[PDB]
Nucleic acid binder design. Sequence first.
DNA 1: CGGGCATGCCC
DNA 2: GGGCATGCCCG
DNA 3: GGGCATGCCCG
DNA 4: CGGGCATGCCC
Lengths: 192, 191, 190, 192
Amino acid sequence: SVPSQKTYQGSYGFRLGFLHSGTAKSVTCTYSPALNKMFCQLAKTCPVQLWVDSTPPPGTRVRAMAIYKQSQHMTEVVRRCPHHERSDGLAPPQHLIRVEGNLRVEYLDDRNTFRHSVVVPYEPPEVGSDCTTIHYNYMCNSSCMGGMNRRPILTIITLEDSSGNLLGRNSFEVRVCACPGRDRRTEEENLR
Amino acid sequence: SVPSQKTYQGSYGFRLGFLHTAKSVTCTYSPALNKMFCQLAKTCPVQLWVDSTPPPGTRVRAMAIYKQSQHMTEVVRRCPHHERCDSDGLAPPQHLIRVEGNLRVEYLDDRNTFRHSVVVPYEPPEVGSDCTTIHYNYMCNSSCMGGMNRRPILTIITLEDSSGNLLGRNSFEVRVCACPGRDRRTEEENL
Amino acid sequence: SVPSQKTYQGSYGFRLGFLHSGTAKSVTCTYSPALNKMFCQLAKTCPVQLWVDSTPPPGTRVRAMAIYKQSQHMTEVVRRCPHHERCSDSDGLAPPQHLIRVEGNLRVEYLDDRNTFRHSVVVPYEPPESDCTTIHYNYMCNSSCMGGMNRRPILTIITLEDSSGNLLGRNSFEVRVCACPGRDRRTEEE
Amino acid sequence: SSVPSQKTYQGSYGFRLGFLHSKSVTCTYSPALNKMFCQLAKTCPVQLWVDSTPPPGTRVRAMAIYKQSQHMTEVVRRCPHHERCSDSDGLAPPQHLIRVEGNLRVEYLDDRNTFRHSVVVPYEPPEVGSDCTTIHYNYMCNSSCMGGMNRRPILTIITLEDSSGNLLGRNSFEVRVCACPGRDRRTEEENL
DNA sequence: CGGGCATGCCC
DNA sequence: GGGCATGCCCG
DNA sequence: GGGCATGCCCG
DNA sequence: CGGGCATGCCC
Ligand SMILES: *C[C@@H]1C(=O)C2CCN1CC2
Ligand SMILES: *C[C@@H]1C(=O)C2CCN1CC2
Ligand SMILES: *C[C@@H]1C(=O)C2CCN1CC2
Ligand SMILES: *C[C@@H]1C(=O)C2CCN1CC2
Ligand SMILES: *C[C@@H]1C(=O)C2CCN1CC2
Ligand SMILES: *C[C@@H]1C(=O)C2CCN1CC2
Ligand SMILES: *C[C@@H]1C(=O)C2CCN1CC2
Ligand SMILES: *C[C@H]1C(=O)C2CCN1CC2
Ligand SMILES: [Zn+2]
Ligand SMILES: [Zn+2]
Ligand SMILES: [Zn+2]
Ligand SMILES: [Zn+2]
């Protein structure tokens, strides 16, 4: 079954935050609140903030998974194109989404659905901060032929206990493109 | 190594011909550039013109190479995406160049140079015709990532005997694109 | 014995020309007239123009050779550093030890001189398509490489030769291979 | 190549390392980073402290590995320039990064199975009136050497072993070989 | 930092 | 055919 | 000890 | 694009 994308704050008040990087043409990543859509470049750092009202228990994990947004493509596993599949020392070459700068990263190929995901332990924010940040990398362009092939995707962020039970969920659309600033302005202008 | 490009009409007067830039054209040839513009997997007719007919057993080989000397040693092959596609029943999935409509087509993977080539027997022109046309197919765009990767290529057409000895050679540049008529006008106007 | 660097226009009025690309920090190759010095990045295209008053005969060749500019280093052969001489930058035609390559010419020829041990690269002269024939040189080590040039400045000598090697003309220019030619040209000119 | 263990192991003899007290200085050790900053080919003293005297024939082996997990499987060796510099003392083969000075009983190993380099000397008990044994190490490449360590930080693994090579103890410390150890220690400390 | 264009694709 | 979608070369 | 030389990084 | 850091080296 297609994994759920429904927003769910859960008993810890789980919410996502994003950096507000603007729409300069050269911007490596930028988030559009009006679209709830992240625009980023291939393999560049894509910060995602985790916000909670109450700290989840030790053993809590944070999983990221991509699915196709269009209903006719939702049952197809999101994976890297054959060119980019051919790197780093921790992530499987087939996985679209990586976590950088975290040696506790763990990747999953699902036994039943064959979907890819990446999971890290939830770590509480630093003494001064009010949120925890994960540095994601997207390893294919949305336009990659033989891969996403111009099909829009969503990234589903799930807060899990140690057993994998759901504690909270949030999602956002992603476009991996060469020009995130240009493309965000173009789509937001097309809301008019 | 690097195969020869030298035009060589040889003992039989071997030369190439091409049919005769709108944005609908499946293929278009530029005499000014000696360059064929064609779309992926669409008919690319090349005419064989000879002054004298070659003997029975003569073969016609086609091979692609990169035009730039910095890439000329790299084997031209299909990109990873299209390699994973669309066979006609005989063409191996990694070969860039195919021949359509010839049951006697042979595809060669050289055991030593690793270069790909496609070979058909030479047929004399039909009654009333003064040339023999072979319908080639290019199975990747010049821009295909992980393949030609926007590098221009040349197609080398060689006339060979059954033993592989050279009888004649010609060549032409080729760009496999989505809008051949458009790119031909741009290149001819950027000179 | 050090190869000659004496400018000689010869019977064909042989001069060099360079593209004027400014001093932006990311410029891949820029020429300073005040210094007669080329600032370029490693393995990037460095255009050198050949200007002649009359077309030299067929068979004419164009050779490029690097020598150290300082007199106390002039007898040392300019070569790549031990690190770079082990890469795979091949290009299919160039020797791994040679500092200077020509890109985009299948008729390129490289020489290790049997007597002087010096490296040079030669291409056939081809008439302009332009008022000038351009050769695309690549320099395969930074001026600062340890065990190679080691921050010593070099001169590139361009010689026009007939098919037998006789001198038809000669010109030269200083070269710095660096990460940021735009920044370094400004610093050296200041 | 498989990565040698870095696990601290005091062993039956309570083996531990010590360092002398610390911008013109040739070497300096930072307790906050467990990191040694030293100059190329300069004396880098390392103290051996034991609670009990190991048996005769015990040896002390030093081996370098890259600290980052990405480069951990790569053998640490001298850059091509320094390997050709012929700056040998007469004992160390030119490819070895780590040398021992002032000990003619030194032995250098090019492991036939792992291809790792190491340098080993006999363990000498502390002299009368002393509490530790000092080995004077030399590092023959800067951390920044192109074609060698190439700005990748390394760890030095010191092992105590018997005559046959069996492990008796292990410690480790990060090391940066640079031109100005005092400047670079101050810089790295001040970034924490 | 990115302007300008290459190149697939849709109307 | 006009124009958009979307990557990238070189400063 | 400043401070420059110079490869590199970062968007 | 430049700003500026990393880092060997010079006064
Ligand atoms: C949104 C709802 C809930 O509150 C839980 C988790 C997700 N769905 C179904 C049950
Ligand atoms: C949009 C992207 C960028 O960030 C710069 C300017 C245009 N493209 C390629 C490089
Ligand atoms: C969400 C948190 C904070 O409180 C500040 C700004 C972004 N992160 C890290 C520090
Ligand atoms: C040039 C090509 C074609 O053949 C049609 C019309 C314009 N483009 C895309 C489809
Ligand atoms: C040298 C010649 C010319 O006259 C211009 C500038 C560079 N080349 C080609 C065109
Ligand atoms: C000067 C060099 C370059 O060309 C760019 C900008 C600054 N450095 C590194 C990348
Ligand atoms: C840091 C190093 C030193 O040890 C002295 C002073 C500054 N540099 C070069 C010499
Ligand atoms: C081992 C220890 C001692 O006993 C003195 C000499 C060396 N080290 C510091 C002081
Ligand atoms: Zn891809
Ligand atoms: Zn393809
Ligand atoms: Zn070098
Ligand atoms: Zn070194």
